Structure 1
Amino acid sequence: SDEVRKNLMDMFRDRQAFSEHTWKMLLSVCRSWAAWCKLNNRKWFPAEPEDVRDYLLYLQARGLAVKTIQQHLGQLNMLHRRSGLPRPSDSNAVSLVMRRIRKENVDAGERAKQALAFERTDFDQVRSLMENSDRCQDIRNLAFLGIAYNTLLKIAEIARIRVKDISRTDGGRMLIHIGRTKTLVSTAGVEKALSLGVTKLVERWISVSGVADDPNNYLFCRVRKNGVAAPSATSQLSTRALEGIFEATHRLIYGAKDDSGQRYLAWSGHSARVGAARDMARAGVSIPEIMQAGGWTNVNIVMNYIRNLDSETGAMVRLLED
């Protein structure tokens, strides 16, 4: 009783031990759960196994994805475990209902998605077009897409790059030091090398932006309607802005998005990562080098990116034809 209050207070005290995104989702699920409780006059904490089961079933009925329902159950599980109480998943009622919800939906044909690919051809086409622009905005967006495709870095890591994090090989190629990504330990970090062509795109961006006037400035910053860039060492270009670049670029070439409300109708933050992976896959690059390139320590996500590649349509056929 007074012990649960402590563990909770201790978790909040050292919040920063967790990603801000984890806390955001924690509070978001809690809102959903509490709201569902208030409406069935149930106690939201500690949660009762039979109530959690009903809630999960309620989520499934709302039509949410299996992965989304796993998130809600998961946040609940952490709140309880980290407080010293047994997890809702510790009961057969909740554990069996999750299995059932996943089996049913998957049986109904539910399948997780992934970003629309941004490959070499796309990058070449975009470059052939924006190359001739003098606008600070265009020069920045081309440099960004360039680094994204070349390095496979996620939008959060690219937004974190500081001017001082850039070096150069003796061949003239730029180097980008990366320290906190989405996984890894000592603090030695890694260096991402840019091709001769892509370093040129970035160089032009540095020149027209003036972000180099201060090393602790972030590489990318905003550019206002009048074309003046606003370097900053305390503010990064929001990852939301970085997704807008991918989307605006897709609109530029293919026009306005559909009206189906669907996800992945245009390029997004992850497009260059999946497109590059599948360009290498097709190039014959080795599994280890690919994993090296994208920073993977496994091979699953990789395998998934080739799945559906047109270049993997099939062998058995010409195998029968002679």
Structure 2
Amino acid sequence: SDEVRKNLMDMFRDRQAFSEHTWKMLLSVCRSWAAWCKLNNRKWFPAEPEDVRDYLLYLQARGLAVKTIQQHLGQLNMLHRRSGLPRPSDSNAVSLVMRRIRKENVDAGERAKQALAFERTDFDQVRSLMENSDRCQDIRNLAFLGIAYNTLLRIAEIARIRVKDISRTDGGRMLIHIGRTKTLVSTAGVEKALSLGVTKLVERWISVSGVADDPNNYLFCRVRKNGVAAPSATSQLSTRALEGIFEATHRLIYGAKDDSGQRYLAWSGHSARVGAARDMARAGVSIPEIMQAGGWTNVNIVMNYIRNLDSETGAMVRLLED
């Protein structure tokens, strides 16, 4: 108990050991679990196997995804392991229900989702509609879509790009140095080159926005109702705003969302990563090259994006079709 107290003090002292996103999820899960425990007269810490099991059944009955349930369990595991206590996962009761819950939800037809693809056909279409808008907002947004599709960078990585990360190649293209990599060994590399077409789009945004007046300015910034951009070296466009661009672009072409509350009814942050992976597959680019283009180390993530493409139909279709 003094041991657990000490262990948790260590966690606070070195809290930068974990992402702020990890902490947010931990806190969210602990609130959920503690609220459920107070309601059901259970002790929330240390978590007992039988109680954790009932809670997971609750999450299932609520309609949460299997991955959501795993997250809740994962956070409980982490809190306990770092406290020096036995993990909920290491119990018979919890291993058994998780097995049961996964099988039941799979058989009930639960599907993992993924971003609606934003592909070359969509990019050309948006390009042909918005190319000659000289509204600042439209100019920024097109440059952003170009970079997203061209580089397969995640929204948080795009939001962090500074003017000084960009140089010019011998061949006329912009080259974006990756200032902060995703991991120590950067599978996606240290640089992303833009095509000559996307280079033009970004050049347009830079000259229109004034961001290059200070090399430390983030590439992308706020554009207010009066078509004036507000460059900043201290404040990034939020990843939320970047998702808004994808959604607005989709609304431009396809109108209002279907309202069914479902996810991925419009393009989102991951849409151009999915779309690019698909276009490379269509063109016959090797799996390893596709994986490097997006900084993937696992084939299965990529497979999920491209597995409904005719080029990926497998040997039996090939055998049967001659």
Distance across 2 between alignment mates of 1:316 and 1:81:
47
Larger mean Cα displacement after TM superposition, 58-67 or 182-191: 182-191
Q: 1:229 is paired with a residue of what secondary structure?
A: coil
Distance across 2 between alignment mates of 1:269 and 1:186:
20
Q: 2:83 is paired with a residue of what secondary structure?
A: coil
| Alpha-carbon offset, residue 83 of structure 1 | 0.9
Distance across 2 between alignment mates of 1:188 and 1:315:
30
1:99 aligns with 2:99: yes
Distance across 1 between alignment mates of 2:117 and 2:230:
31
Q: Is the 8 A contact 2:176 2:192 kept in 1?
A: yes
Structure 1 pair 46–315 and aligned structure 2 pair: CA distance change class (3 A)? closer
Q: 1:192 is paired with a residue of what secondary structure?
A: strand
Distance across 2 between alignment mates of 1:131 and 1:290:
28
Q: Is the 8 A contact 2:141 2:245 kept in 1?
A: yes
Distance across 2 between alignment mates of 1:271 and 1:181:
21
Larger mean Cα displacement after TM superposition, 13-22 or 145-154: 13-22
**C-alpha offsets along residues 118-138 of structure 1, whole Å, 9 cap, x if unaligned?**
000100000011110111100
Q: What root-mean-square deviation, in Å, do the aligned CA atoms of Structure 1 and Structure 2 show?
A: 1.9
Structure 2 match to 1:39 = 39
Distance across 2 between alignment mates of 1:54 and 1:180:
42
Structure 1 pair 192–74 and aligned structure 2 pair: CA distance change class (3 A)? same
Q: Is the 8 A contact 2:281 2:311 kept in 1?
A: no
Equivalent pairs, count? 322
| Alpha-carbon offset, residue 169 of structure 1 | 1.0
| Alpha-carbon offset, residue 179 of structure 1 | 4.0
Structure 1 pair 56–128 and aligned structure 2 pair: CA distance change class (3 A)? same
Q: Is the 8 A contact 1:179 1:187 kept in 2?
A: no
Q: Is the 8 A contact 1:178 1:190 kept in 2?
A: yes
Q: 1:167 is paired with a residue of what secondary structure?
A: strand
Q: Is the 8 A contact 2:161 2:179 kept in 1?
A: no
Structure 1 pair 38–231 and aligned structure 2 pair: CA distance change class (3 A)? same
Distance across 1 between alignment mates of 2:314 and 2:91:
46
Structure 1 match to 2:164 = 164
Q: What aligned pairs does 1:208-219 form with structure 2 within 5 A after superposition?
A: 208-219=208-219
Q: 2:176 is paired with a residue of what secondary structure?
A: strand
**C-alpha offsets along residues 228-257 of structure 1, whole Å, 9 cap, x if unaligned?**
101111110000000000000000001111
**C-alpha offsets along residues 96-126 of structure 1, whole Å, 9 cap, x if unaligned?**
1111111111122211010100000100000
**C-alpha offsets along residues 158-201 of structure 1, whole Å, 9 cap, x if unaligned?**
00111111111111111111143443438996000000110110
| Alpha-carbon offset, residue 286 of structure 1 | 1.3
1:21 aligns with 2:13: no
Runs of 4 or more consecutive aligned structure 1 residues displaced over 6 Å after TM superposition: none
Structure 1 pair 268–316 and aligned structure 2 pair: CA distance change class (3 A)? same
Larger mean Cα displacement after TM superposition, 308-317 or 273-282: 308-317
Structure 1 match to 2:121 = 121
| Alpha-carbon offset, residue 38 of structure 1 | 0.8
**C-alpha offsets along residues 34-70 of structure 1, whole Å, 9 cap, x if unaligned?**
1001101211111111110100011001111000000
Structure 1 pair 319–186 and aligned structure 2 pair: CA distance change class (3 A)? closer
| Alpha-carbon offset, residue 288 of structure 1 | 1.7
Q: Between the two proteins, what is the percent identity of the paired residues?
A: 100
Q: 1:82 is paired with a residue of what secondary structure?
A: helix
| Alpha-carbon offset, residue 297 of structure 1 | 1.8
Structure 1 pair 167–318 and aligned structure 2 pair: CA distance change class (3 A)? closer
TM-score (norm 2): 0.96
**C-alpha offsets along residues 138-170 of structure 1, whole Å, 9 cap, x if unaligned?**
000000000000000000100011111111111
Distance across 1 between alignment mates of 2:185 and 2:174:
24
Larger mean Cα displacement after TM superposition, 121-130 or 89-98: 89-98
Q: Is the 8 A contact 1:250 1:267 kept in 2?
A: yes
Q: Is the 8 A contact 1:223 1:229 kept in 2?
A: yes
Structure 1 pair 76–193 and aligned structure 2 pair: CA distance change class (3 A)? same
Distance across 2 between alignment mates of 1:210 and 1:86:
56
Q: Is the 8 A contact 1:179 1:189 kept in 2?
A: no
Unaligned runs of 5+ in 2: none
**C-alpha offsets along residues 3-36 of structure 1, whole Å, 9 cap, x if unaligned?**
1111111111211111110000000001100100
Distance across 2 between alignment mates of 1:151 and 1:188:
10
Distance across 1 between alignment mates of 2:279 and 2:321:
27
Distance across 2 between alignment mates of 1:210 and 1:192:
22
Structure 1 pair 207–188 and aligned structure 2 pair: CA distance change class (3 A)? same
Distance across 2 between alignment mates of 1:178 and 1:7:
36
| Alpha-carbon offset, residue 316 of structure 1 | 5.4
Q: Is the 8 A contact 2:284 2:311 kept in 1?
A: no
Larger mean Cα displacement after TM superposition, 278-287 or 100-109: 100-109
Unaligned runs of 5+ in 1: none
Q: Is the 8 A contact 1:159 1:239 kept in 2?
A: yes
